[PDB]
Amino acid sequence: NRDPASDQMKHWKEQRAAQKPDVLTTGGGNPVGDKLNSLTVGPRGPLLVQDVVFTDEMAHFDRERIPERVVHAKGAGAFGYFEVTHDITRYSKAKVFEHIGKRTPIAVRFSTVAGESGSADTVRDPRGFAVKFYTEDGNWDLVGNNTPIFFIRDALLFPSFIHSQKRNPQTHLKDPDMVWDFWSLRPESLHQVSFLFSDRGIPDGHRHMDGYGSHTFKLVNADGEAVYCKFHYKTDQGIKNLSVEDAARLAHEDPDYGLRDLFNAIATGNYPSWTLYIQVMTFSEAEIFPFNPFDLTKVWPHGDYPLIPVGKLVLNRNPVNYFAEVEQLAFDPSNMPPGIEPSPDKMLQGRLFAYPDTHRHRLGPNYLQIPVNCPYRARVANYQRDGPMCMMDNQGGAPNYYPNSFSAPEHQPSALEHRTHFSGDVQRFNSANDDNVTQVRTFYLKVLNEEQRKRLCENIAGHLKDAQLFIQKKAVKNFSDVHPEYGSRIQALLDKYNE
Amino acid sequence: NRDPASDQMKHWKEQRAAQKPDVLTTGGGNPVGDKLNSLTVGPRGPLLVQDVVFTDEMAHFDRERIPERVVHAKGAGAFGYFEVTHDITRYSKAKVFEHIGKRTPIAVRFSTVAGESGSADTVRDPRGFAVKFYTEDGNWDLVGNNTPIFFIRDALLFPSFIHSQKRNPQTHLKDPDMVWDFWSLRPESLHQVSFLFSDRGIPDGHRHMDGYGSHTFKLVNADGEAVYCKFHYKTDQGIKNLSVEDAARLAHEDPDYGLRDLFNAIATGNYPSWTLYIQVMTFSEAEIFPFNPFDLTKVWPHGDYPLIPVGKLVLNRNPVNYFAEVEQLAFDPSNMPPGIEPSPDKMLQGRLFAYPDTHRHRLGPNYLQIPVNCPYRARVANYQRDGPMCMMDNQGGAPNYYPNSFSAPEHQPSALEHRTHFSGDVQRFNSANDDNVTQVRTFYLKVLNEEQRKRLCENIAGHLKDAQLFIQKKAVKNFSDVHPEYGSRIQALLDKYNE
Amino acid sequence: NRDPASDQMKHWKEQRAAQKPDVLTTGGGNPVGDKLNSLTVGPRGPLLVQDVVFTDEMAHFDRERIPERVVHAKGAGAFGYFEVTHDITRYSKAKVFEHIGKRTPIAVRFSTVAGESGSADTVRDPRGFAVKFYTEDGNWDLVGNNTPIFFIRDALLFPSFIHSQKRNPQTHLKDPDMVWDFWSLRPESLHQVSFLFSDRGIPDGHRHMDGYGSHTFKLVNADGEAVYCKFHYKTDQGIKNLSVEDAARLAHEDPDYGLRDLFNAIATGNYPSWTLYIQVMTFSEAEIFPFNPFDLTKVWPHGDYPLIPVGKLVLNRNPVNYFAEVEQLAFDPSNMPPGIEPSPDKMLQGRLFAYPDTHRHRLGPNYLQIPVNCPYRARVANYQRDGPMCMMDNQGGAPNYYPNSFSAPEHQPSALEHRTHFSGDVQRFNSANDDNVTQVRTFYLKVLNEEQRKRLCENIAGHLKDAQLFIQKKAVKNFSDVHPEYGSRIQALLDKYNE
Amino acid sequence: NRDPASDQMKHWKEQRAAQKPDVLTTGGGNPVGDKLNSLTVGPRGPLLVQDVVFTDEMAHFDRERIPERVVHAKGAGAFGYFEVTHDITRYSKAKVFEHIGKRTPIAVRFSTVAGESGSADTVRDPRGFAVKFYTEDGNWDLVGNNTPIFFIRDALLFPSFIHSQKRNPQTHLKDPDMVWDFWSLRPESLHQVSFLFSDRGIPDGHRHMDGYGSHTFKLVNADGEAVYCKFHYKTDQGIKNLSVEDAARLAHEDPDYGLRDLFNAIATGNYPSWTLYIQVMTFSEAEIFPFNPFDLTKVWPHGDYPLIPVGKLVLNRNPVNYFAEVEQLAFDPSNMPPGIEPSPDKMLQGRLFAYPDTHRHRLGPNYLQIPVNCPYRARVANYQRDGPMCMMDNQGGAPNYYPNSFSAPEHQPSALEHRTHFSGDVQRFNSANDDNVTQVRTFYLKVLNEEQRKRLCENIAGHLKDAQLFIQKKAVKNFSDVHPEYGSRIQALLDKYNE
Ligand SMILES: NC(=O)C1=CN([C@@H]2O[C@H](COP(=O)(O)OP(=O)(O)OC[C@H]3O[C@@H](n4cnc5c(N)ncnc54)[C@H](OP(=O)(O)O)[C@@H]3O)[C@@H](O)[C@H]2O)C=CC1
């Protein structure tokens, strides 16, 4: 006997042992008589068009693939629920937080960032940790990472960042010169880069890492009063990492290590869970905060803004069909129920357009009609119609225009957005020079110990050594600007690696 | 008070007066607070991306259209049932014919041939009369026209034919020279052309014309014995046509005449119906038949092959949403339940491939998962997986490969095809000169009376006069080959039209 | 001899009389030996899969159609040039206006608004008059109508307006209750409806109507100084309209009248031209303007803001293939060269998003690589890569990320946008009650004469009589609000029509 | 200094040192003023829709991906030429062989079979070796593997085979039970499985393996005489393999080993080349051949059917843009110029449909218009029009129907297919028990030496040990049937691996 993942077909057969096998049909539901031999003229003659059994099967085989995600393509999924344990109704009126005890169905995707569909699980990379809450006020997608921060703080740099992380447009190879020419030209990366190359760069599967919303978000209570917040979901299973040595062995021994670990845990009843907390910053703490509180390269320090618990995320169910339920999952940061709103974070503002946009391409115009994407715990009603692959009565014969004197759906005034006042020139403000070093210095000196600093520098040098000298020089200077000993250690190791 | 079609919204409201109107949401199920005013900075300021309510609705609006059908684009739809009235089980074992009294849900689409989505209903053109039977053995699509015959007898001439009937590739205008250059170069068109320019070329709506499967099909009984057949469905409302003068007034007065007629009839309880008959030819009779029994430009004469009755088609339901239920309808002549099979008709052999092919483009790869297209009275199970817009459980965790020791679906040996023997060179055989005139001569002399022949020639001359003289000459010569008086009457009229 | 349009094929043959006809190939370039007969086993045998000549052609036929435009689907195209005739360089630094005499290639499309591909030309609807300028600074799309104004002033009402103008979602019929329910609920429509139902609602083809950008736009000169402007392009051929009576005859006699008129004109050297003028409003004048200067339902009166001439638009070339050059034409109001900017017009702010969005659906992700869409008078260079149907080098091996130390494309600082100051609450402002009546009153009383007022009301009553009584009442009231006699004349005529 | 692949961007900049960098534009050719900072109201304000620079770039980023290939997704490409060295015009009349010395440009793509886009190069799998010849008679696609044979001999088992080789539909994990259940239920796989688990299962890059067409094809000379043939292209660089130990190290050290090796070889002038040979079998030898000569699990032994040389394949140019030139490469076994025809091989018959079909889904309806797919050395002329993303003049105003009196393209009678006679029942013939063991016995005993047999069984057992015991037993039995000592060595090793 072997691990439960491998006994999948064995189990599927056992769970069916009582009934007869189904009649094998065409997609049109016509039974087939023989599907191992083609309709031909004579045993050694040519194939016939009449063989629509072959055509029907081949055409669908021919159309099996859809575009992979443009980032976060390698993915593992599971299902479960969110349960409220504490009362934060004074900050948010969202139905998902309505009383202690309330459960909401969730769906989760875990991913790496750079790799395509066939890439190894145990590599140095950030991890996507996206959570879809199926609430009565519609779906809530908290599309977060394994980090509170990101490498950049304006969405116009995003496609670039990603290009620089992926393959060279001519050679189709990972290119250290791209990676570090970008990172060194944009020192705002200093904070997230430092996180990346320390121990948590390679987590031991998905169950031993935290999730963050990373963005500042806005919560709105029943009175119309607003606060800003951060979401943190901390692992109940404890932070646990892989060493470079073990991560590399597994990269060839089990490219699908995280995917297997997740499935096996759930199947053996060992159900993983997280504790959701928030931090809260009032509008008048946001004016006097020393950095830009919407800067995605900055955290809110725990000393000044402590964690306030909200509840548990629990994963207790595996997908039944991986393609249907985890490859077709779409998360839109813009799916926000009343009580939860966007901050003016430049990066989050971008993600409000990007995701529904890419989903309309990757999946299709009507991708919200795909069961796992459906807001099945809410009644969708509006004046949208048609599109390719329309799957429900399309709304019926309801009046399709608004306003109307025929009692089609009505707007709900309580669901209006919080109103903020803004003033300034409409222009492109340069954010390149928001303090890129301070929080990093703290991280280096105060969070990391002696050994961890040493490994941090070894990890960095071990990858930066493959970039050209002029690029190394500039990266080193950026690291020096955080701490002279940071730069020095890295430079001592580069001197050796250069022969 | 007006016709029922005009009162559609009125009625929708009345049927609802007892409830409160639904909450208006985004596609993600989020309630909207205001949907008449955009989120802007100040009353005369610019739009924000934060307005996801605007984007969500606009992005769907933008994706509303799908490619119209490449032919038969203008269509009217309805739903009802087929009921068996007579016993033809000695010819076919198909479940849809199993006992007298058996009802099968049907869907029907009526169409013109050449015009695009906005064209007028009451024009000279053949009419499509596609019929989908939802049987327990899977769907059966009888994709027929208002005529027993077509213009050509090889599928390689079809794209041409259609091109010649549609718009000039440069000017985007209907082009008489294309129409008649083709027809004159291909006299096999003489039969259908004579049908088209008779009174029956403009039916008074969809309720007053016949349906034909036109092709020869094959029927297989329980013993494994086969005969060849034609399907005729005759209107129970009686043949009725529009005159040229009335058809033209309606063309601007009500471009949607046949659509409104069909809807109002069903809504006022006058449900239209057809009687399904067959003609049967034994394999032996096929060998001694004077023409090619699979030549789509030929009928089987009634004297030698009388109509045997089978059933009634009844339309008693209107569609609730026209896009969902009529624009997305897909018929495949290749959806044939055991007991019905194709003949070797060159034209039908082409249709076996073309329709599923075009559907994968027009609707999409999984178009069969769209409710109206679903074989919902059959259990679909096989080794096909994935594809864009996957809508069910994607057949779950079932083993996806065949054969397997894990009890996935099995082939059903009784559903094998009838075995026929063929012998000859694999080669492209010329069918341009199969008899092109005989059956037409009969039609001209023995089916039409004196007045009808006169109108036939007037309708032909009225359209042919716009073609160049060399094209007119050649067409007239083809008409002379049927009968000298046919030719000379047309020529006398062209002499006048040419001034 | 006939009109030039109908001699198209004749002329194509004459222009080729010297050369031999090309060898007919598969799409893959393989010469075909016979394309009139299918590869079968024996003359009355079944079709083989190894007929790849058949398949290759049918598969393309099957994929001929693409989605029609979601609005303005019925269209006519031509090509030509714009020529600067007057100096407005003090207002705009745009390369297209650089010197008197300067010519720029243009592409125009003319459309109706509501009809689908097959619909008649001579119907009451607004007309599209889209101009694409191929400038050295990239493409400039002036996507305009044959009216200075529009029915609504917020883009969130757009999809609804269009739904109401189109087909009932159940009956698939034009529905007067939808049309007038909307218009009567949204009186802002009063101005444009008044235009629509007067003589100019049916132009005598495309050569006898004006064009307008409708929107307020922003112009920016070499100094960085901005002004607001309107674009009017008046016909040099003179305004000319069809009467209801002749428009209806032509709707069946020649569904393609505007198409044919334009093609024949250009083919016979009678080249239509328009004169481009602007109106200019300074930023100061914009603060004191009595209405909202960016309200799409308002004009700037000629007394206070006279027309200032700029140049000529001339159409002197017909398309060669209609599909490639006129069905695939894409216009984006967002294509604006430096010198021309958007105003804060709520309506135009929406069009900035909508068009590129729909274009990616209707044609494809890389639609801008389609010859007629290409900015071929400029050099496209950036960090965009890949996508479906990539057609040039894909920009080679050039570094694909920005910034870089490898000399890929650089930003041009002089191309930066004009900076404006805005202040106010970020919220949804109600525009429902901006002055809906004043400019219409002026239209009714001061622009129209006696006869025209009469015809205006007859035209309104002829269509409004098909709506329910409660809808009539409410519409009439909106017209009374413009002028008591306006409401009255309409009501007297409805009184008659209601028997 | 490092390898040439790593210096790609370095070299790109050098090759450009003399010019100024290009102006950065929108896709519409509009220069951009700043592309690092988003348009916002105030430095800490929300993003605007007016930022069309952001949307234009993000929208394209969002549509970057297309469906990977359904099999052979991981790939490497190069370009060069084919040169004729010997005279085989007595067998084939194709222009590509027309005289000694004749050069034809080619495109090659090397690939693995099961892995997706991100999988490792140095793994046990067959290798695709597809060659596209750009002939005057249109494209010739020789779509071959690094082996003469395949695992199955009917096309209806293909989707299954592939499913069995890829991921479990629930766990998304590679599944040994699927792999060997299939292989053990279908012993026709014995031949190719033995090849695969032997030394040549993991080639040292693409330059050190052979290519085969595998299928029997047909050749036709000027006299209309025909013979059957096999294409073998043998590496000029010599067969060279990796050991299991090294292949596994490289799988994590350089997942893109083969890609890097090819690019580096070409860049340093060391240009790889292959020698094209055929085997020839007369129609009459085909009738007496001891096996089915069209059975894809069978080879033609060299003693009886020696290699005849034809020419050289040389790869001397790297792609400039990987996506444009290698990801969008499409090969159709159905692209065959006159002089080359298909045999009746059941498998090949299915490939005639599959490839164009999948290309229409993967790339698009008009994928043959993509530069690298174009038959750019032929003149494509026919009656095919339109489709999504139509890129040329769409063949202008040419008459679009056939036949015509207007001198559009004509069929070329010399390019008719060879005519063969076939006779038999049209039915599904069972090919499951054609000899499954004879040629495999020969391979085991006569081709492998003692050491190699040892490694073969070690390789087989190392993978087969993960499958269930009943599956093991069955596979071993299939191996015993080839030779008792084959099955018995594998069983001795499985006994140990099962503890
Ligand atoms: N305040 C925050 O939200 C976080 C801050 N940081 C870093 O700590 C600095 C000071 O934060 P402050 O709140 O004042 O200090 P604290 O000491 O209160 O917080 C330390 C935090 O760092 C996280 N952490 C520990 N090791 C690593 C690592 N190797 N990689 C990434 N994260 C790690 C811990 O997460 P855990 O709870 O799992 O132990 C803990 O939340 C910041 O400048 C920032 O660099 C990092 C994460 C969160």
Side-chain angles (χ1 to χ4, degrees), chain A residues 269-402:
Chain A
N270 197 32
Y271 299 146
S273 72
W274 285 260
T275 309
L276 186 63
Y277 299 89
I278 62 177
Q279 292 169 283
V280 157
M281 178 187 282
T282 63
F283 270 45
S284 65
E285 289 178 294
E287 284 315 78
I288 72 137
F289 192 62
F291 314 99
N292 175 7
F294 316 131
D295 187 336
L296 184 59
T297 70
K298 303 292 172 300
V299 298
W300 302 350
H302 296 137
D304 283 308
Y305 297 89
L307 297 170
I308 293 160
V310 186
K312 294 264 169 173
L313 304 169
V314 180
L315 297 181
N316 66 10
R317 188 161 54 108
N318 285 322
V320 173
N321 177 282
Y322 180 91
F323 179 91
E325 296 158 39
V326 173
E327 172 71 49
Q328 275 174 145
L329 263 174
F331 299 92
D332 300 312
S334 62
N335 276 325
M336 276 166 176
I340 308 166
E341 281 187 42
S343 80
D345 189 331
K346 280 167 174 193
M347 291 273 290
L348 179 64
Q349 294 281 313
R351 300 179 57 195
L352 294 168
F353 166 78
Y355 291 74
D357 194 58
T358 203
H359 289 142
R360 288 166 198 130
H361 166 80
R362 173 161 79 83
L363 302 165
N366 280 304
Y367 77 101
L368 285 172
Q369 300 181 19
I370 296 175
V372 80
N373 288 327
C374 192
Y376 70 94
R377 278 181 33 116
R379 293 198 114 206
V380 177
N382 49 38
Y383 302 84
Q384 299 172 40
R385 302 294 185 268
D386 311 357
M389 294 299 269
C390 205
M391 294 297 163
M392 278 185 204
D393 290 345
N394 191 355
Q395 277 189 70
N400 64 6
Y401 67 95
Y402 187 75

Side-chain angles (χ1 to χ4, degrees), chain C residues 239-430:
Chain C
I239 291 298
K240 203 182 165 189
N241 306 290
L242 291 165
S243 71
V244 171
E245 182 174 14
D246 284 329
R249 185 179 38 89
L250 290 169
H252 80 282
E253 246 167 24
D254 201 353
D256 309 317
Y257 173 87
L259 188 147
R260 191 185 301 273
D261 170 83
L262 186 72
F263 191 99
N264 290 340
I266 288 151
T268 65
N270 188 30
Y271 301 135
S273 75
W274 288 254
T275 305
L276 187 60
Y277 296 89
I278 59 177
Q279 288 170 303
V280 170
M281 194 183 276
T282 68
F283 272 44
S284 303
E285 291 183 291
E287 284 326 83
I288 61 171
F289 189 63
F291 318 94
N292 171 13
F294 319 125
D295 179 349
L296 195 52
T297 74
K298 303 284 174 289
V299 297
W300 301 347
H302 294 131
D304 295 313
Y305 301 88
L307 266 55
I308 294 155
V310 179
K312 291 251 168 169
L313 310 173
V314 180
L315 302 177
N316 65 8
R317 181 160 53 99
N318 282 329
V320 178
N321 173 282
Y322 180 95
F323 182 80
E325 288 150 44
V326 180
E327 180 69 46
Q328 273 175 167
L329 254 176
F331 301 89
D332 304 304
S334 79
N335 290 319
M336 271 164 182
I340 307 162
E341 280 172 44
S343 76
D345 199 318
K346 283 182 178 186
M347 284 283 286
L348 172 71
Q349 296 277 315
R351 309 177 59 197
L352 296 176
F353 169 78
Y355 291 61
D357 183 68
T358 206
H359 287 336
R360 292 159 201 130
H361 166 78
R362 178 160 77 80
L363 315 155
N366 285 309
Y367 75 100
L368 285 174
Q369 308 187 1
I370 296 169
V372 76
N373 293 328
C374 204
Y376 69 89
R377 285 288 209 111
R379 183 151 215 192
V380 179
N382 51 36
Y383 303 84
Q384 296 172 37
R385 298 292 186 272
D386 306 12
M389 293 297 271
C390 208
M391 302 302 184
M392 293 177 182
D393 289 345
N394 200 22
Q395 289 173 79
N400 65 351
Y401 68 93
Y402 187 80
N404 55 82
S405 295
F406 290 94
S407 314
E410 301 285 298
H411 83 105
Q412 186 185 93
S414 72
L416 177 63
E417 292 110 349
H418 175 261
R419 292 163 9 218
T420 319
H421 188 276
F422 289 114
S423 188
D425 296 311
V426 161
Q427 77 170 13
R428 304 180 177 268
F429 296 84
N430 204 6

Side-chain angles (χ1 to χ4, degrees), chain A residues 147-149 191 194-195 198-200 210 212 232 234 239 279 299-303 307 438-440 442-444 446-448 452:
Chain A
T147 325
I149 53 176
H191 203 181
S194 302
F195 281 7
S198 83
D199 295 350
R200 299 185 186 189
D210 299 327
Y212 305 86
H232 305 230
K234 296 202 186 187
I239 288 306
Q279 292 169 283
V299 298
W300 302 350
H302 296 137
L307 297 170
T438 302
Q439 292 207 326
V440 201
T442 290
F443 178 69
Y444 188 75
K446 265 69 157 85
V447 184
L448 296 187
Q452 291 160 342

Side-chain angles (χ1 to χ4, degrees), chain B residues 6 28 43 62 71 79 171 181 193 232 261 324 336 347 384 413 415 435 482:
Chain B
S6 315
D62 286 333
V71 296
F79 299 81
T171 60
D181 190 39
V193 159
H232 304 234
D261 178 65
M336 268 168 185
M347 293 278 289
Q384 306 179 27
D435 192 319
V482 174

Side-chain angles (χ1 to χ4, degrees), chain C residues 3 10 19 113-114 155 200 207-208 210 253 274 296 307 394 412 424 461 470:
Chain C
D3 80 346
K10 187 194 194 253
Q19 39 198 131
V113 187
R200 304 200 181 176
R207 288 177 311 108
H208 299 269
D210 307 325
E253 246 167 24
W274 288 254
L296 195 52
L307 266 55
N394 200 22
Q412 186 185 93
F470 86 83

Side-chain angles (χ1 to χ4, degrees), chain A residues 182-202:
Chain A
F182 193 79
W183 279 344
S184 64
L185 286 165
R186 308 290 308 203
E188 60 259 48
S189 53
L190 271 157
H191 203 181
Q192 173 53 28
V193 160
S194 302
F195 281 7
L196 186 63
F197 284 92
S198 83
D199 295 350
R200 299 185 186 189
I202 320 172

